[PDB]
Amino acid sequence: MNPPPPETSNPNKPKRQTNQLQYLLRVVLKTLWKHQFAWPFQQPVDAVKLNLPDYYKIIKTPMDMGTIKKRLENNYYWNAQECIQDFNTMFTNCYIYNKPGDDIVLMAEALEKLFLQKINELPTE
Numbered sequence: 001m002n003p004p005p006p007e008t009s010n011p012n013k014p015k016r017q018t019n020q021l022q023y024l025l026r027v028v029l030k031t032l033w034k035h036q037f038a039w040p041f042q043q044p045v046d047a048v049k050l051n052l053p054d055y056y057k058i059i060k061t062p063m064d065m066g067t068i069k070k071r072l073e074n075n076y077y078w079n080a081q082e083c084i085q086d087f088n089t090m091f092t093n094c095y096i097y098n099k100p101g102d103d104i105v106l107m108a109e110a111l112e113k114l115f116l117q118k119i120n121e122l123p124t125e
């Protein structure tokens with residue numbers, strides 16, 4: 001069974017746009033999105049569709065790049081670190097739920113390397 005997807009808007013949370021957050025949407029996310037291993041991470045895990053009934057019994061802070069994309073498009077984040085933390089949650093969830101060497105983990109490890117490459121240098125204020 002699927003829990004509700006993570007929020008992509010929250011009127012109680014203040015919004016902000018920065019050069020670094022614009023970069024994270026325009027170059028980091030949009031480039032990762034085109035990677036050949038991106039497709040498993042482009043939407044929230046649908047436990048019913050993918051036949052993973054234990055996913056949300058294990059993973060209590062789900063995150064995906066479709067959620068991050070909508071958050072960036074909506075200026076949901078206060079700063080780039082909050083967005084980077086969502087990316088890191090997405091990668092760590094994959095390592096937590098699976099085991100080393102699994103095909104999905106190899107996909108996540110390659111995307112994580114490309115992500116770290118791209119956020120190594122951010123634009124300034």
Ligand SMILES: COc1ccccc1S(=O)(=O)Nc1ccc2c3c(cccc13)C(=O)N2C
Pocket residue numbers: 040041045050051052093094095097098103104
């Ligand atoms: C049951 O399906 C599969 C079984 C084996 C390999 C691949 C798939 S899958 O790619 O078709 N389904 C999945 C999509 C997204 C994810 C996972 C994870 C673990 C296992 C499956 C999947 C996971 O951490 N994420 C983010």
